C-alpha cells in the first residue's frame, strides 16, 4: 500500500498491478506463466521497484541485491534496479519504472524475480484499430455523428 | 513467398529483421567468404554439434 | 539459451556465461537466460540472433 495514493482519504495502490513484499522475513523466487486462450492480442503491464536506499531495500525484499527478468517468444530483456537518492515527487523519494509488451495469441510470458517486482494483477485483451489518434480538448461531449 | 515455410530450422528471435531486409533488398556486388576457418580457429572447442 | 540449467551444464560446463561482441561502432554484451517455454519445432530452448 502506498501513502501517495489517496482514494476516499485512504492509502491505496494501482488497481491493475500488485506490489509484492516479503513474508515471514524471506522472499522466495517466483515463476509465473500465462497461456493466451483469449484468441486476441493481450497487453500486460509490469514495473520494477527502485528503493530509496539500501536500508529500505533490505527491509522490503530481505536482499541487498535483486533482479527481475521477463522473457517471451519475441521480446526478452534483463532488468536491474538502481539504488540511489532521487528528487522527491508527490512525497515519494524513490521512483518505479513501468514497462509493457504486446503478446500475440499462442504466446506465453514468463516472470522471474527475487524482488523489486510489481506484479500484473490485471491484463487487457484488445483488438487492433489502425488509426484515430488521441486529441486534447476540454469541449463538452454531444451525441451526434460527424465523419 | 507470402508464407515462408523455412524461416529458421532452429527456433529463435531475429534482431532488426526489417532493417536487414531493407539492407539486403538491393545489392551491387555480393560475395560469400569464410570469415573464420572451421578447423584452425577452434582447436580446443568442439565444432561438430 | 538452454531450456534448463542441466542442459547448460551438460553442453557448456558453466553455470553462468557471458557473450560480448565489440567493434569501433557497435558494441554490446549478451547474457544467456535459462527459462522454460513452449516447444516450437520440437525444441524448448531458442537461440537469439
Ligand atoms: C521446411 O519446411 C517444411 C514444410 O514443408 C518442413 O517440414 C515440416 O516439418 C515439421 C517439423 O518436423 C513437421 O511437423 C511435424 O510433423 C509430424 C509428422 O511428420 C507430426 O507428427 C508433428 O505433430 C508435426 O506436425 C511437418 O509435418 C513437416 N511438413 C512437411 C510437408 O514435411 C521442414 O521441416 C522445414 N525444414 C527446416 C525448417 O529446416
Ligand atoms: C533463487 O534465485 C537466486 C538468484 O538466481 C538463486 O541464487 C543463485 O543460485 C545459483 C544456483 O544455486 C548459484 O550458482 C548463484 O550463485 C546464486 N546467486 C545468488 C546471488 O545467490 C537461488 O538458488 C534461487 N533459489 C531457488 C530455490 O531456486
| DSSP string of A14-62, one letter each residue | -SSEEE---BTTB---EEEEEE--SSSEEEEEEEEE--SSHHHHHHHHS
- The Cα–Cα gap between A93 and A132 comes to 38
Q: Grid coordinates 517471451 are at which residue?
A: A72
A29 lines ligand 2 (CB under 6 A): yes
- The Cα–Cα gap between C41 and C33 comes to 20
Kindly tell me the sign of the dihedral angle through the C-alpha atoms of A86, A90, A92, A95: negative
- The Cα–Cα gap between A97 and B44 comes to 45
Which among A92, A86, A89 is positioned nearest to A3, based on CA atoms? A92
DSSP C10-24: HHHS-SS--EEEE-S
Q: Which residues, numbered 54 to 83 in chain A, qualify as contacts with chain C under a Cβ-Cβ cut-off of 8 Å?
A: 69, 71, 73, 76, 78
Residue B26, C-beta contacts closer than 8 angstroms, at least 6 positions apart: none
Judging contacts by C-beta atoms under 8 Å, the chain C residues touching residue A110 are: 35-37
Which strands, in side-by-side order, build the sheet including A76-79?
Answer: A30-35, A108-113, A68-71, A76-79
Q: Which grid cell is C5?
A: 540449467
Q: How far apart are the first and last CA of chain C?
A: 11
What kind of experiment solved this structure?
Answer: cryo-EM
- The Cα–Cα gap between C34 and A7 comes to 41
A114 lines ligand 2 (CB under 6 A): yes
Q: How far is C13 from chain A (nearest CA, A)?
A: 23
Judging contacts by C-beta atoms under 8 Å, the chain B residues touching residue A104 are: none
Amino acid at each position: 500500500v502506498s501513502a501517495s495514493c489517496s482514494h476516499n482519504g485512504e492509502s491505496s495502490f494501482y488497481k491493475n498491478l500488485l506490489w509484492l513484499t516479503g513474508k515471514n522475513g524471506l522472499y522466495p523466487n517466483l515463476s509465473k506463466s500465462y497461456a493466451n486462450n483469449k484468441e486476441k492480442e493481450v497487453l500486460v503491464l509490469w514495473g520494477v521497484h527502485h528503493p530509496p536506499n539500501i536500508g529500505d531495500q533490505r527491509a522490503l525484499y530481505h536482499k541487498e541485491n535483486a533482479y527481475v527478468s521477463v522473457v517471451s517468444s519475441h521480446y526478452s530483456r534483463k532488468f536491474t534496479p538502481e539504488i540511489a537518492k532521487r528528487p522527491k515527487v508527490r512525497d515519494q523519494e524513490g521512483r518505479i519504472n513501468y514497462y509493457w509488451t504486446l503478446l500475440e495469441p499462442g504466446d506465453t510470458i514468463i516472470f522471474e524475480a527475487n524482488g523489486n517486482l510489481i506484479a500484473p494483477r490485471y491484463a487487457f485483451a484488445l483488438s487492433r484499430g489502425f488509426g484515430s489518434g488521441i486529441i486534447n480538448s476540454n469541449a463538452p461531449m454531444d451525441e451526434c455523428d460527424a465523419k | 513467398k507470402p508464407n515462408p515455410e523455412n524461416g529458421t530450422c532452429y527456433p529463435g528471435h531475429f534482431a532488426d529483421y526489417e532493417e536487414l531486409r531493407e539492407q539486403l533488398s538491393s545489392v551491387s556486388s555480393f560475395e560469400r567468404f569464410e570469415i573464420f576457418p572451421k578447423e584452425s580457429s577452434w582447436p580446443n572447442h568442439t565444432t561438430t554439434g
